[PDB]
Amino acid sequence: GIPHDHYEPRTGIEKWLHSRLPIVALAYDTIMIPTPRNLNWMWIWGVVLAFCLVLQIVTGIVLAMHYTPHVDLAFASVEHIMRNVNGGFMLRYLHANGASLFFIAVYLHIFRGLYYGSYKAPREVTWIVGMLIYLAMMATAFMGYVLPWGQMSFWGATVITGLFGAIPGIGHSIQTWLLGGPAVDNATLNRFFSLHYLLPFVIAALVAIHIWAFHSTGNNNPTGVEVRRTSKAEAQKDTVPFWPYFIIKDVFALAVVLLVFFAIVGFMPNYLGHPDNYIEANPLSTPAHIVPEWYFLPFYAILRAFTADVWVVQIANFISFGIIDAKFFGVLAMFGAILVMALVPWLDTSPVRSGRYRPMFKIYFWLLAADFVILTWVGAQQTTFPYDWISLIASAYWFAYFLVILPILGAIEKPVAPPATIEEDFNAHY
Amino acid sequence: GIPHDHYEPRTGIEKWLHSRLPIVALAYDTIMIPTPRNLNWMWIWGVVLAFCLVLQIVTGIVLAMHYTPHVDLAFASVEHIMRNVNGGFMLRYLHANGASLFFIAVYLHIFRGLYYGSYKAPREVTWIVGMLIYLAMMATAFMGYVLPWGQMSFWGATVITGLFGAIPGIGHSIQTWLLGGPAVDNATLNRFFSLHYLLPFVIAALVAIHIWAFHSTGNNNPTGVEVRRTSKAEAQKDTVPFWPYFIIKDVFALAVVLLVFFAIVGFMPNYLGHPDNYIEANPLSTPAHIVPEWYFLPFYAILRAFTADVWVVQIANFISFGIIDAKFFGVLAMFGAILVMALVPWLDTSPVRSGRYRPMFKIYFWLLAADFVILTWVGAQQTTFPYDWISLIASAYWFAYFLVILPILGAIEKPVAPPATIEEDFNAHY
Amino acid sequence: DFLYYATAGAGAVATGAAVWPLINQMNPSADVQALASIFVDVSSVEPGVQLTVKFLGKPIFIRRRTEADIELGRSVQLGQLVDTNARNANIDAGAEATDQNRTLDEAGEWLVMWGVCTHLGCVPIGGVSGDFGGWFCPCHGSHYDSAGRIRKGPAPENLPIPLAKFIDETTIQLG
Amino acid sequence: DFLYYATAGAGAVATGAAVWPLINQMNPSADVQALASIFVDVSSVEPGVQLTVKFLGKPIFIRRRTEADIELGRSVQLGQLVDTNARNANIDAGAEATDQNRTLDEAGEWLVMWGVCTHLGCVPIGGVSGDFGGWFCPCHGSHYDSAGRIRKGPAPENLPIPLAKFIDETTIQLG
Amino acid sequence: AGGGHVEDVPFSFEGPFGTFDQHQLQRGLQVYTEVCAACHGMKFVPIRSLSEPGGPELPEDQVRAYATQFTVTDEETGEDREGKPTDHFPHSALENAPDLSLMAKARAGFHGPMGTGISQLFNGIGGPEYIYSVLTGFPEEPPKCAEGHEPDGFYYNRAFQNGSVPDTCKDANGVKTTAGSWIAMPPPLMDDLVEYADGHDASVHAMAEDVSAFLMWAAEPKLMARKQAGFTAVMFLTVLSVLLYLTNKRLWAGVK
Amino acid sequence: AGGGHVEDVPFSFEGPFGTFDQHQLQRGLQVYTEVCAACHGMKFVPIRSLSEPGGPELPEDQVRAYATQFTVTDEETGEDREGKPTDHFPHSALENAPDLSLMAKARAGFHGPMGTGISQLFNGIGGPEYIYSVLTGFPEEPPKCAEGHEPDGFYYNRAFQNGSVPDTCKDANGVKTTAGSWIAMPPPLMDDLVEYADGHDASVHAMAEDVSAFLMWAAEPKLMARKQAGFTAVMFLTVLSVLLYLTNKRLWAGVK
Ligand code: HEC
Ligand code: HEM
Ligand code: HEM
Ligand code: HEM
Ligand code: HEM
Ligand SMILES: CO/C=C(/C(=O)OC)c1ccccc1Oc1cc(Oc2ccccc2C#N)ncn1
Ligand SMILES: CO/C=C(/C(=O)OC)c1ccccc1Oc1cc(Oc2ccccc2C#N)ncn1
Ligand SMILES: CCCCCCCCO[C@@H]1O[C@H](CO)[C@@H](O)[C@H](O)[C@H]1O
Ligand SMILES: CCCCCCCCO[C@@H]1O[C@H](CO)[C@@H](O)[C@H](O)[C@H]1O
Ligand code: FES
Ligand code: FES
Ligand SMILES: [Sr+2]
Ligand SMILES: [Sr+2]
Ligand SMILES: [Sr+2]
């Protein structure tokens, strides 16, 4: 709702079209939205996520023209792609590393939103639409990893599908319904492949609402001071149009990101992978170490940190009359990490927007960023000492940030005066 | 662009939501558009096409959870669905007959648009978006028929892919590129399955623009008299809101349509099918009769009507110095039927909108409707006498309607005075 | 008012009638339900001969123990075993790992158990092998006795016993 | 002005470099390209013995004609044939259907042709069959002579001859 | 090719309320096991379906013993073994004997009148009725035009259309003057070739009807389940249509 | 289990500008065919790829004659025949001998330091360098703790980690005190076990290096093509990044 200028049909072809379908108008008002002119480099990841979703669908559709979702043929069809399909070896590594590029982007995209308070009002709907995209992404990549049908494909699916069996009462039915049988088998691979095709289109729809969301309220900025929308002469001082100023700024940053991503795919495409996935699926041979991909490690650490001898786990099992066993507690704690992150608009009671002007919050944020790396690290470690304690301290601070610290901080925070306008902050730098 | 009343947030949750993402507003203004109150039963087929697209995607996704796109397993996985998957026999017939229900709907949807002049201005963009949907539908259904990998699946794909070889010069490269090899084989089945998943989502996007198109200009009516857009008090006399008046009228008509469709799927699900497709794909045994499904028959008749001894064909081969042989002529004539139907806004030069008030046009239209049925009938007949002549007169009249008759009629037609307003025609009926 | 409520309920019932087949389709197929149990014809199985059978993707061992194999089984005390649980679905879970509880018949002649090593799921070699006259796992070196109980190796627990019973004089119903 | 145009041109080149791999992936795989031609070892093929080989999905017959089979081939006149076209890709399309043009060598000893009936694509039975000392199609009753030319049946044309040649004294390269 | 004549059998499964006769499918199973199985197979039919509902409905122990007569190569081991109900019927023993899993839906008995599909609309596809016309369509002697010109190893059949015909029987433009054509299948049915348990009629006509009914169930085991689903969808949609009609009327009553 | 030590071999294919040594891949092919093939197989490698570019690059006639030594069951006929280039290498003749198609990508040579991934970042996964350490990791005598307690049918190897260990060599809590463990593979390489045409060095270390390089190509035939594509994408994106930088600078120059 920022004062800009409407689209005017210019030539004759535009007047003929605007009076039937104003699509050239929706493209002008969208690509000419007033964007704050103080945006730093942390506002590029939306475009990198946009590029990623197109990359995964394009290479995804191509790889489906040569993949066979069947246990007897899946592993071979992927090596058929590597060895025989023209450039098929590059298309897999683009699709495989592409998920890592797609998942490192959201975490910088998200931790951007956690620092600068882009989740706080009026931007709750952008966050909730964001969280749903986050769930579809993880469910999509999880089912995608099953498709090569290696060891990690089979046994990763065997562990995670078993967590649904730990639900009280209805857990066995949901596991049977999911697997289509007593265990991970061909029906699981057959249905996981179909849903792996579907959900990226569902994600594409959510990105449309995601983009409709922040266009309604306007882009946040490092100061947290909204754009002045009382006069066109004022808004022009706080903002510049999207095209060409930030289009070229994002497309520039995308080129640098791809310059790294292609160097990874071009020279170390297997660094971010598990060698066990080049071993065919063996139901009669468990690997030595069942490690998810790096973008799932912090939720894997929270799952295994809550063993049966943890004090909080024993208290729950006693209170719940045996309903909440040690395994189901880990399930709640694993998905609970998502939920507290989704409720962070209603847990952060501070009226201050950006974390730039919150001294005490700034400490706890950077500990969360460090804590996320630690959770990602212990996820690959064993359950032995001292890693069982490192994950338990780390899992604890994750929930303490959202459920305890952020509500308490809203009462005792001693903020700092933000600038009066975006213009002040932009001129303070230059 | 009809005068209606804006959406007002009512409860507290609506004010909280409308000030962030006005999705409840876009849903209210859309479902409350002023629609003419004189619409007859031929305006239901748009909604029947909407239900069909959902049915094919829903049952499509389910069938993909149990189908194997591989030559050795495709035919068996489909009989696995018939015999073992819970309700899989009903889901296939819903998907198979659903395409026939999906294709009988467009032809009534289309011949509606040809009679009432819904293709003429300002509705050109709605038509072109309509035609693109028609191509994705046919390309989608064609590739879907390959997936059971029966006799008709293999040999139907063998004939149609061969038409691309008839293009001068570049024809062999496009056929090799399409097939992925010297002939229809597993690579063809593998890629057709991927594109069969993609195009229904692409069709869904085109329907979004399709619905944005007629909402911009407004729905046509049997009279061709546009809604009066000078005052809200006038529009209310010519129109009624979509919800609940026409929603219940269309959902009523859908229930009647499904009452027929489910009886077909429930008691004669194979009447609209070819028995040869229950025979596995045999490259060493051509069937006696390669028949496409009924919704492709009229274009199949136009293809075979132009043999090498047709006078128009011999003239073309002589003029073109042998470039346009008998085969490539049939290809142009088969796709040319689509093109002339797409250009019908620019071939009908009459300024009159509806065909209800064009006496001489009314004869040539109903001859086209009979001509369409005749093309659908001769498409399954042999090339022997007299069917070679019946299809040739029928193929001739198809192009004469669009290229010759309709342009000439615009100059010499003696129309009839339409009503002054939609209000007059609505009270004239009751 | 009845009409506007009956029309809504009939539509919701129709919606529910259309949604439930879309859920139940993902339940196990008719062919997977048919592999829930199998029937073995042990009419031509003499003592000492092992009979390996496929069940739920993995193998099951059905060995008719001889006079010597049963002697070593009943001689072991409960304190000498690494795992004192029988790991049998038929009897209660709290049953002890006695040789009389590791078989179906009171004579202890028929031994039915999962041929799946509890360490990581390998198939031990049968036909009197190892250092205890039983089964030997070649993946990491797990030794089992004649009764199918772990005595040495990384294997934590004993080999589980499925739900098995004799439907007649010469047929066993697994699962 | 060069910068704003070079930046656009460099972007279009990158787009085109990314689009062409997305097209060429649908071209025939490396395993299909390897079946574009094959090599047959005819070292142990005596006269009268037929050798069926798979090529492009369909079978090809490679029969070393005997002294009697070659006699009947060269005795037939051009007017007695139903189809006077040789149907050979090596020589020109306008070549006549003489027995000397239906073989690779001047001696007319080796006959190579598609083992696919031109009627509807069935596999005729070989080993001297039919009413002309050649091949007989059991699908509808198409009779072929010793030279592989149609003489009786629904088959319109003769059996096509692929692009074949002798690379050495005892190897033929088809395609 | 085209479509000739066939014997219209009043099968029980025909019509909206049609259901398979359980005893008839048991007889046709016996006729399949003792006659057609020698050359033909049913690679897509699981043996366990003989105890499934809406079919022969045998006890599982009979099907368990029935499956043992077949020899099956184990998918894992590779050594032969006795067949289980979990296995499918064997492939066709004879090479050019087509599989009979889906034969009752892979052949059309009724066509025409003029490629208009009016016959199949009121008579159905005619699959199980066409098989009946092939088995009982082996005459004593061939036609008059074919005397002394039958292809060796083939047999004339009235219903079979996709077979060869001697030149003596063709017209001036290749069309055959015979009703059917020559099939590679010898006449498989003979009077009283099977002795039923309940002493039922075992004539060639009775066996061809029973085995035809069995072959329909083999192609569609879920025929009876489908017609109940079809009937149910009609009941929901008929009521909902009547309610939606009156609702549309009262709702539009304040306009017209 | 965990990750032990390995010999860091200066393979030619390592590094951005690394390429396979053609003669080396030819030597390892000879060592595979004459030594490793007795137990191992390469079910995913097509034989025709021996003449593919970026590899051994043999003439097609040699690969044609090389493929004849294998006995292959025809996919259609079922009878055995001489192998063509179109066929893959056979499965492992020995059951518990794992397939070697992707062994150079299915095993990691470098791990650590502390699960931080710093070693693989600068040293790579270490697949072909770990295989070299298994072949050349068979010592003369076992460790001191294992004298007279080796499991029968197994052999000690320094690099192998996923093998059994006697109780005499384990610590108080099950962990092994040996560098490696006991592998079921006998030491396959012996000095001068293969006679190369050009008299190249055929020591156990030289053969283990060459066959490791060959086994890398078997897992990734398209290594050299990938690094050209990677280098090319870097050049396009470096120029486009620099142009997009300057464009972004001039474009924002009318604001700052
Ligand atoms: C039988 C006489 C063998 C010959 C000759 C070769 N290999 Fe082998 N190999 C064999 C077995 C039975 C095993 C399994 C060992 C176990 O304990 O499970 C192996 C294993 C390998 C491996 C995998 C090691 C691992 O970490 O899992 C490799 C990389 C390997 N062998 C390499 C190899 C090479 C290069 C050979 C030719 C020089 C060779 N082996 C010969 C059996 C036999
Ligand atoms: C494919 C997935 C995604 C795409 C394509 C995407 C795209 C974008 C874009 C283009 C923007 C505009 C400003 C910017 O670039 O930051 C944006 C903003 C934002 N996104 Fe996302 N995003 C995705 C995922 C997510 C996720 C997973 C979350 C949170 C869980 C999220 C939450 C937000 C928030 C809070 C903003 C700030 C909006 C504002 O400032 O008004 N997004 N996103
Ligand atoms: C949009 C986000 C997507 C994500 C996050 C994703 C994720 C993944 C991952 C992690 C893998 C495993 C790759 C490997 O290790 O080999 C995979 C494989 C696969 N994906 Fe996707 N994918 C996406 C889109 C798609 C789409 C739209 C398709 C549609 C056809 C698709 C089809 C496939 C196929 C066929 C495979 C198996 C082949 C292979 O592994 O290369 N993917 N996916
Ligand atoms: C998935 C396929 C389609 C869907 C779901 C769809 C949907 C609709 C709907 C709901 C309407 C308004 C109600 C009505 O007219 O009955 C409409 C109108 C129309 N559609 Fe379609 N349609 C489809 C395909 C097509 C095709 C194939 C064409 C032409 C080749 C076409 C051209 C038109 C035209 C001319 C109108 C009238 C526009 C107006 O009255 O302003 N549509 N469509
Ligand atoms: C415009 C939408 C669609 C149309 C017109 C369409 C049409 C068809 C047709 C006519 C068949 C042949 C049916 C048969 O021979 O049994 C078919 C098969 C198939 N289609 Fe679709 N379809 C659509 C959507 C989809 C979607 C979205 C998917 C996947 C998610 C899908 C998956 C399949 C599968 C797996 C088959 C083979 C199994 C079968 O034949 O039932 N369809 N399609
Ligand atoms: C099919 O298994 C795939 C895996 C993977 O990492 O794919 C990229 C995987 C492999 C080994 C073990 C587990 C694996 O899957 C997963 C999946 C996963 O997804 C979640 C993410 C956040 C919260 C809950 C879950 C779950 N479940 N969190 C952790 N591991
Ligand atoms: C895979 O073949 C599918 C067919 C089909 O009808 O599917 C529903 C088919 C079967 C037999 C013969 C041909 C078949 O395909 C087709 C496809 C077809 O599509 C077109 C429709 C209009 C204009 C041009 C084409 C083409 N090509 N027009 C006619 N036959
Ligand atoms: C056009 C609307 C048709 C309504 C359904 C008519 C159903 C009658 O149709 C008949 O159904 C029988 C069911 O077994 C089948 O045996 C017949 O083959 C079929 O023609
Ligand atoms: C972190 C991004 C750095 C740019 C990519 C350079 C990666 C070079 O990394 C090298 O790649 C070689 C190519 O095969 C491997 O052989 C080496 O093992 C690896 O170290
Ligand atoms: S797997 Fe059985 S002992 Fe290691
Ligand atoms: S198919 Fe060869 S003659 Fe009919
Ligand atoms: Sr304790
Ligand atoms: Sr009848
Ligand atoms: Sr190195």
What does the domain layout of chain B look like in residue ranges?
A: 1-430
Q: What is the three-state SS of F139-152?
A: CCCCCCCCCCCCCC
Instruction: Compute φ and ψ for B23, nearest 5 degrees.
Output: -85, -30
Query: How far is residue C70's CA from residue C107's CA, in Å, rounded to a whole number?
Result: 9
Query: How far is residue B29's CA from residue B215's CA, in Å, rounded to a whole number?
Result: 10
Which amino acid, E25? L
CB contact set of E101 (below 8 Å; sequence gap of 6+): B79, E41, E42, E43, E44, E45, E89, E218, E219
**Looking only at Cα atoms, what is the longest distance across chain F?**
84
Tell me the catalytic residues of C. Answer: 140
Instruction: Compute φ and ψ for A360, nearest 5 degrees.
Output: -75, -35
Tell me the catalytic residues of D. Answer: 140
Name the closest residue on chain A to residue D32, using Cα atoms. A84
CA B170 vs. chain centroid, Å, equals: 29
Q: Collapse the DSSP code of B355 into the 3-class scheme (helix H, G, I; strand E, B; otherwise coil) and give the result.
A: helix
Q: Which residues 109-128 in chain E show a CB within 8 A of chain C?
A: none
Residue nearest to atom 7 of ligand 7 (CA): B142
What residues of chain C lie within 8 A of the CB of B58, using their CB?
22
Query: How far is residue B241's CA from residue B29's CA, in Å, rounded to a whole number?
Result: 10
Structural domain containing residue F206: 1-221
Cβ(D42)–Cβ(D112) below 8 Å: no
Q: Which of B210, B250, B338, B340 gets mutated to test ligand 4 (max ligand atoms within 8 A of its CB)?
A: B210
* CA of residue D26 to ligand 7 center, whole Å: 21
DSSP string covering D32-49: HHHTTSEEEE-TT--TT-
CB contact set of D20 (below 8 Å; sequence gap of 6+): none
Query: How far is residue F31's CA from residue F34's CA, in Å, rounded to a whole number?
Result: 5
Query: How far is residue B81's CA from residue A145's CA, in Å, rounded to a whole number?
Result: 25
CB contact set of A82 (below 8 Å; sequence gap of 6+): A88, A89, A92, F220, F222
Q: Collapse the DSSP code of E182 into the 3-class scheme (helix H, G, I; strand E, B; otherwise coil) and give the result.
A: strand
Residue D154 contacts E, CB cutoff 8 Å: yes
Which amino acid, B294? W
Query: How far is residue A37's CA from residue A25's CA, in Å, rounded to a whole number?
Result: 24
Cβ(B52)–Cβ(B102) below 8 Å: yes
* Nearest chain A Cα distance for residue B190, angstroms: 5
Measured between CB atoms, which of A248, A267, A380 is closest to F248?
A: A248
What residues of chain E lie within 8 A of the CB of B91, using their CB?
none
Instruction: Compute φ and ψ for B208, nearest 5 degrees.
Output: -65, -45
Q: Collapse the DSSP code of C53 into the 3-class scheme (helix H, G, I; strand E, B; otherwise coil) and give the result.
A: strand
Residue in the block written with tokens 């005792």: A412
Tokens standing for residue C3: 């009409």
> CB atoms < 10 A from the CB of B178, how many?
19
> CB atoms < 10 A from the CB of F175, how many?
10
Query: How far is residue E64's CA from residue E44's CA, in Å, rounded to a whole number?
Result: 18
Name the closest residue on chain A to residue F231, using Cα atoms. A266
Cβ(A92)–Cβ(A84) below 8 Å: no
- Geometric angle at alpha carbon B55, from B54 and B58, rounded to 5°: 80
Q: What is the dihedral of CA F188, F193, F199, F204, to 10 degrees?
A: 40
Query: How far is residue B415's CA from residue B351's CA, in Å, rounded to a whole number?
Result: 10
Pairing outcome for strands D142-144 and D134-137: antiparallel
Measured between CB atoms, which of B251, B266, B278 is closest to E229?
A: B266
Do both F162 and F103 map to the same domain? Answer: yes
Query: How far is residue C97's CA from residue C81's CA, in Å, rounded to a whole number?
Result: 8
Whether the upstream peptide bond of residue A351 has omega within 30° of 0, thus cis, is no
* CA of residue F39 to ligand 14 center, whole Å: 27
DSSP string covering F170-215: B-TTS-B-SSSEEESS-----TT-S--TT----SHHHHHHHHHHHH
Query: How far is residue C159's CA from residue C61's CA, in Å, rounded to a whole number?
Result: 10
DSSP string covering B381-412: S-SSTTHHHHHHHHHHHHHIIIIIIHHHHHHH
Closest C-alpha among E137, A194, D122 to residue B77: A194
Whether residue F27 has its Cβ less than 6 Å from ligand 1: no
CB contact set of C107 (below 8 Å; sequence gap of 6+): none
Do both F123 and F238 map to the same domain? Answer: no
Whether residue C125 has its Cβ less than 6 Å from ligand 10: no
Query: How far is residue C34's CA from residue A182's CA, in Å, rounded to a whole number?
Result: 12
Fold exhibited by the domain C32-174: Rieske Iron-sulfur Protein (2.102.10)
| Alpha-helical runs (H) found in chain E | 22-34, 60-66, 103-106, 118-123, 127-135, 204-219, 223-252
Indicate the number of domains in chain E: 2
Do both E193 and E244 map to the same domain? Answer: no
Whether the upstream peptide bond of residue A418 has omega within 30° of 0, thus cis, is no
Cβ(A397)–Cβ(A365) below 8 Å: no
Please state which architecture CATH assigns to domain A1-430.
Up-down Bundle (1.20)
Whether residue E14 has its Cβ less than 6 Å from ligand 8: yes
Do both F227 and F217 map to the same domain? Answer: no
Whether residue B47 has its Cβ less than 6 Å from ligand 4: yes
* CA of residue A286 to ligand 10 center, whole Å: 9
Closest C-alpha among A63, A52, A136 to residue A101: A52
Residue nearest to atom 12 of ligand 2 (CA): A46
Compute the half-sphere exposure of residue A322: CA atoms within 13 Å on the CB side of its CA: 1
Instruction: Compute φ and ψ for A126, nearest 5 degrees.
Output: -60, -35
Read off the DSSP letter of residue D64: E
Residue F225 contacts D, CB cutoff 8 Å: no
CB contact set of A68 (below 8 Å; sequence gap of 6+): A74, A76, A77, B68, B69, B70, B190
Measured between CB atoms, which of D27, D32, D121 is closest to B284?
A: D121
Residue nearest to atom 26 of ligand 5 (CA): B60
Closest C-alpha among C136, C102, C115, C112 to residue C40: C112
Closest C-alpha among B361, B363, B371 to residue B399: B371
Q: From residue B278, give the alpha-carbon distance in Å to each of B59, B187, B421, C134, E32.
A: 20, 22, 56, 53, 20
Do both E153 and E243 map to the same domain? Answer: no
Query: How far is residue A85's CA from residue A65's CA, in Å, rounded to a whole number?
Result: 10
Residue C111's H or E segment, with its range, is strand C110-114
Q: From residue E36, give the alpha-carbon distance in Å to each of A3, E47, E185, E189.
A: 83, 16, 11, 9
Chains touching chain F through at least 3 C-beta pairs below 8 angstroms are A, C, D
Do both E174 and E226 map to the same domain? Answer: no
Q: Which of B95, B294, B296 gets mutated to test ligand 5 (max ligand atoms within 8 A of its CB)?
A: B95
Burial of residue A224 (number of CB atoms within 10 Å: 0-12, 13-18, 19+): buried
Atom of ligand 1 nearest to the CA of F162: 26
Cβ(A25)–Cβ(A5) below 8 Å: no
**Which ligand has an atom closest to residue B56 CA?**
5
Measured between CB atoms, which of A62, A83, A251 is closest to D22?
A: A62
Residue C59 contacts F, CB cutoff 8 Å: no
* Nearest chain D Cα distance for residue E192, angstroms: 33
CB contact set of F111 (below 8 Å; sequence gap of 6+): F2, F3, F119, F120
CA C2 vs. chain centroid, Å, equals: 58
Name the closest residue on chain E to residue C13, using Cα atoms. E236
Question: Interface of chain A against chain C, CB under 8 Å?
Answer: 176-178, 180-183, 185, 187, 191, 283-286
Mutate to test the interface with C, among F149, F162, F164 (most CBs of C within 10 A): F164
Q: Collapse the DSSP code of A133 into the 3-class scheme (helix H, G, I; strand E, B; otherwise coil) and give the result.
A: helix
* Nearest chain C Cα distance for residue B198, angstroms: 21
Whether residue D137 has its Cβ less than 6 Å from ligand 11: yes
DSSP string covering D78-142: TTS-S--B--BSSS-TT-B--GGGSSSSTT--EEEEE-S-TTT----EEEEETTTTEEEETTTTE
Do both E136 and E254 map to the same domain? Answer: no
What's the start-to-end Cα distance of chain E, in Å? 58
Cβ(E150)–Cβ(E183) below 8 Å: no
Burial pattern D112-142, b for ≥16 Cβ within 10 A else e, equals bbbbbbbbbbbbbebebbbebbbbbbbbbbb
Query: How far is residue D13's CA from residue F116's CA, in Å, rounded to a whole number?
Result: 39
Burial of residue B233 (number of CB atoms within 10 Å: 0-12, 13-18, 19+): exposed
Query: How far is residue F237's CA from residue A317's CA, in Å, rounded to a whole number?
Result: 56
Residue F73's H or E segment, with its range, is strand F71-73
Q: Which residues 157-176 in chain F show a CB within 8 A of chain C?
A: 163-164, 174
Burial pattern A163-199, b for ≥16 Cβ within 10 A else e, equals bbbbbeeebeeebbebbbbebbbbbbbbbbbbbbbbb
Which amino acid, B98? G
Closest C-alpha among E148, E154, E159, E67 to residue E108: E159
Instruction: Compute φ and ψ for B130, nearest 5 degrees.
Output: -65, -45
Angle of helix A151-163 versus helix A171-179 axis, rounded to 10: 150
CA-based Rg of chain C, rounded to a whole angstrom? 23
Look at the alpha carbons of C44, C49, C55, C60 in this order and tell me if their dihedral is positive or negative: positive
Name the closest residue on chain B to residue E249, using Cα atoms. B249
Residue A113's H or E segment, with its range, is helix A88-115
> CB atoms < 10 A from the CB of A370, how many?
12
Closest C-alpha among A26, A15, A22, A25 to residue B216: A22
Cβ(A50)–Cβ(A207) below 8 Å: yes
Q: From residue F212, give the alpha-carbon distance in Å to each of E90, F25, F129, F220.
A: 47, 9, 7, 12
> CB atoms < 10 A from the CB of E204, how many?
17
Do both F73 and F183 map to the same domain? Answer: yes
Domain ranges of chain C: 32-174
Residue nearest to atom 4 of ligand 11 (CA): D140
Query: How far is residue B354's CA from residue B116's CA, in Å, rounded to a whole number?
Result: 4
Burial of residue A145 (number of CB atoms within 10 Å: 0-12, 13-18, 19+): buried
Pairing outcome for strands D150-152 and D164-168: unpaired
What residues of chain C lie within 8 A of the CB of F151, using their CB?
141
Put simply, the answer to whether B122 touches A17 (Cβ < 8 Å) is no
Atom of ligand 8 nearest to the CA of E122: 20
Query: How far is residue F79's CA from residue F72's CA, in Å, rounded to a whole number?
Result: 8
Query: How far is residue B264's CA from residue B271's CA, in Å, rounded to a whole number?
Result: 8
Closest C-alpha among E135, E138, E140, E127 to residue E220: E127
Which amino acid, A368? L
Look at the alpha carbons of A331, A337, A342, A346 in this order and tell me if their dihedral is positive or negative: positive
> CB atoms < 10 A from the CB of F143, how many?
19
Residue A187 contacts F, CB cutoff 8 Å: no
Query: How far is residue A101's CA from residue A48's CA, in Å, rounded to a whole number?
Result: 9
Residue E183's H or E segment, with its range, is strand E181-183
> CB atoms < 10 A from the CB of A305, how many?
26
Residue in the block written with tokens 């956690």: A114
Closest C-alpha among E149, E36, E166 to residue E98: E36
CB contact set of B191 (below 8 Å; sequence gap of 6+): A65, A66, B180, D26
Measured between CB atoms, which of C6, C17, C39 is closest to E64?
A: C39
Put simply, the answer to whether A87 touches D24 (Cβ < 8 Å) is yes
Name the closest residue on chain E to residue C40, using Cα atoms. E84
Query: How far is residue F189's CA from residue F38's CA, in Å, rounded to a whole number?
Result: 12
Query: How far is residue A391's CA from residue C141's CA, in Å, rounded to a whole number?
Result: 33
Do both E73 and E152 map to the same domain? Answer: yes
Q: Enumerate the β-bridge partners of residue D52.
A: D61
Tokens standing for residue E1: 């090719």
CB contact set of A104 (below 8 Å; sequence gap of 6+): A295
Cβ(E70)–Cβ(E41) below 8 Å: no
Q: From residue C175, give the alpha-carbon distance in Å to each of C15, C61, C170, E77, F15.
A: 38, 14, 17, 22, 56
Do both E12 and E92 map to the same domain? Answer: yes
* Nearest chain F Cα distance for residue A170, angstroms: 36
Do both E136 and E23 map to the same domain? Answer: yes
Cβ(F82)–Cβ(F72) below 8 Å: yes
Name the closest residue on chain B to residue A217, using Cα atoms. B20
> CB atoms < 10 A from the CB of B381, how many?
19
Look at the alpha carbons of F147, F148, F151, F152 in this order and tell me if their dihedral is positive or negative: positive
Instruction: Compute φ and ψ for B34, nearest 5 degrees.
Output: -70, 115
* Nearest chain D Cα distance for residue A5, angstroms: 26
CB contact set of D69 (below 8 Å; sequence gap of 6+): D48, D63, D128, D133, D146
Read off the DSSP letter of residue C101: G
Beta strands (DSSP E) in A167-301 are 239-241
Query: How far is residue B100's CA from residue A14's CA, in Å, rounded to a whole number?
Result: 39
Do both F203 and F245 map to the same domain? Answer: no
Whether residue A303 has its Cβ less than 6 Å from ligand 6: no
Burial of residue A237 (number of CB atoms within 10 Å: 0-12, 13-18, 19+): middle
Query: How far is residue A81's CA from residue A147's CA, in Å, rounded to a whole number?
Result: 13
Whether the upstream peptide bond of residue B244 has omega within 30° of 0, thus cis, is yes
Q: From residue B10, give the alpha-carbon distance in Å to each of A123, B34, F119.
A: 21, 21, 62
